[PDB]
Point group: C3
Chain length 265, copies 3
């Protein structure tokens, strides 16, 4: 219980509530700190969104090259890619890439539309045995992160196990598994979070999330050199420290976890 | 037509709108009084909620032993089992048992979340050919029972038929069928309603519902001695009599239906 | 295209926004004018609603002869058939017939209940590869047609493609496709729109839509003599002319599309 104690101290310093799940596929060994408590997902849901879209592509019900057009009026805030393509539109794949690697919010709304809504995202998760995660609203309202509101939440343990199933299970075809991995590995938004505490020679894919009420999140798949991948889901909400210090909490969680795994071997 | 006249009179004495459906599987014989009209389900939907969960267990997408945790602030009113387990949580199976046999409302929400919400329960019902019943809202709001509002409603006939399909058709595995039976037979909230009016030697499973606007419901599977099961769905809403008197209306429906089915055979 | 320019002028006279898609199954030829912009469906979605009901009949999950009863409080405006059957109810088939050929609004709400609501119609569309069209609301609210609101919209191109798939593809059984076709051919509400501008010896089925903000729509399947069918989806919204002039805009679209198709040869 040393990791547990250090995480509790860290949580105390943050002023908020911190959830952590680790899933090591070399052994099946897990670790949880509030792993079975609900947390607002904010943009971490977008990893699941892209999986759902890829599943439809595997089914022949969707095409990565299909072009979606939209208006200036459709933009919501934090849309650094989609705001550049009002004139020419974007393909389903480009929206996926933008939603994951730049956390583009309009991209995610267009892609929820492609599924038919947040309820369809939730059905896809239920179809793969994640009985926990739920999406309820669109961008930007799904980031309100109100305490005690179960909408648009997951648990760290549920997210970790679902990310595992998606990337290593047979939910997605091999080509779609690789595509999702490649998008996560190319994430541009996460350099001050889990990536920052991880050893530099770890190969990392991640998706961040950020919201109201001091919410800062990050989920990742990590390949240490010559080892099976490890899944790490970290959620922080109700934090009373500023945005930089919240990023550092997440970076510190990776440091703490890595050091804990080191003392297993 | 004598049973229909009797039920018209009892309806007048309830001061509300009464709905009855009977489905005898010995013969397929049916009877309805307003069997075609919508009524607020209130907790009777939980029988269907448990069925949806079990079907996902059948499918390997859900596990009855899967533990679910929650906090004090997730509790809603009428949660006598879930309020005792804020600390250690409950399994899928324990929640379905609390939802059925104690009508626990928070257990029902947690289970709705396990399906993905009211719309997922509705979709389950559409997937077994129930094109009538609909769940729109969560607990406690789905009990508002406002006249003319179709949300969260069924008809007596559709609920009797869906209950028959669930317990005796091939929607559920045989193990899951028996589990749903066992839960309804184990119900603790229905002693003043249909059970009260049925002959003591009948073996009975039921699920009650109770809501605003004087809404008082009960659905049952009933095995008379050496006889095939009969399904009985009874809905009472907009009633102007007090709660013990509404319960007695339901008990009287069971007495009248039993007496009329006797007159069938003899 | 001269046709694109002719439609631009017609659009400008209308003061609103005009969308046109043509899909010719004899040749594969396609034409679009704003074919990829979203437009409020209003009652044109009822052609999709019926198809989704017929799908379930085909699946053994629904019955055309099933009777639905309802009370007088359940009626919404524009229910010329259902208001005559509060006493005795209507069958599913009757309700589809009323929703398509008289654009009965209560009939559409009862059938939407039969599916389980707007999201279940959206899920039907997604299941056949229409990743665009969406239903969100019930009658009468789905007709508000606010500019910029993507609820209850399609695109002219998506709707022409979906209609083609429903009426000619393998989604519906031979009997259900013929039944949908017969209902469209029996439409009573479209005499001043596309039908009015098509040559009199064309065999036509159609579904109209009308809404707030100057919205007037008509989608149609057309069989010219001795020819495979042509799908024609025409949406007009934000128009600044009165209801009769908007109908005449739709008639003129048909005339212009016919003339353009003649001058291909
Ligand atoms: O992601 N991780 O939970 C994790 C665990 C152990 C490690 N060792 N090196 N990188 C690691 C990452
Ligand atoms: O549940 N029943 O409607 C029902 C009908 C006839 C009966 N006879 N004995 N028990 C009976 C129950
Ligand atoms: O519906 N049409 O787009 C259409 C196009 C060309 C035609 N020529 N004859 N009828 C026609 C209908
Ligand atoms: Na009526």
């Amino acid at each position: 219980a040393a990791l547990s104690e250090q995480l509790a101290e860290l949580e105390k310093r943050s002023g908020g509530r911190l959830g952590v799940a680790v899933l090591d596929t070399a052994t099946g060994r897990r670790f949880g700190y509030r792993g079975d408590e609900r947390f607002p997902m904010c943009s971490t849901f977008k990893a699941l969104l892209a999986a759902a879209v890829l599943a439809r592509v595997d089914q022949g019900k969707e095409n990565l090259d299909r072009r979606i057009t939209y208006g200036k009026e459709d933009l919501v805030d934090y849309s650094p890619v989609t705001e550049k393509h009002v004139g020419d539109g974007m393909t389903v794949a480009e929206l996926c890439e933008a939603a994951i690697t730049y956390s583009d919010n309009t991209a995610a709304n267009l892609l929820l539309e492609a599924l038919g809504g947040p309820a369809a995202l939730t059905a896809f998760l239920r179809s793969i045995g994640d009985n926990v995660t739920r999406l309820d609203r669109w961008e930007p309202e799904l980031n309100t992160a109100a305490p005690g509101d179960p909408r648009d939440t997951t648990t760290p343990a549920a997210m970790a196990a679902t990310l595992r199933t998606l990337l290593l299970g047979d939910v997605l075809s091999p080509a779609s598994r690789q595509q999702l991995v490649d998008w996560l590995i190319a994430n541009k938004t996460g350099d001050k979070r889990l990536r920052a505490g991880l050893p530099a020679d770890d190969r990392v894919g991640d998706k961040t999330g950020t919201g109201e009420h001091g919410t800062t999140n990050d989920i990742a798949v990590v390949w240490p050199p010559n080892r099976a991948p490890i899944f790490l889901a970290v959620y922080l909400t109700e934090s009373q420290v500023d945005a930089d210090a919240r990023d550092a909490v997440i970076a510190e969680v990776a440091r703490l976890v890595v050091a804990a795994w080191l003392h297993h071997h």
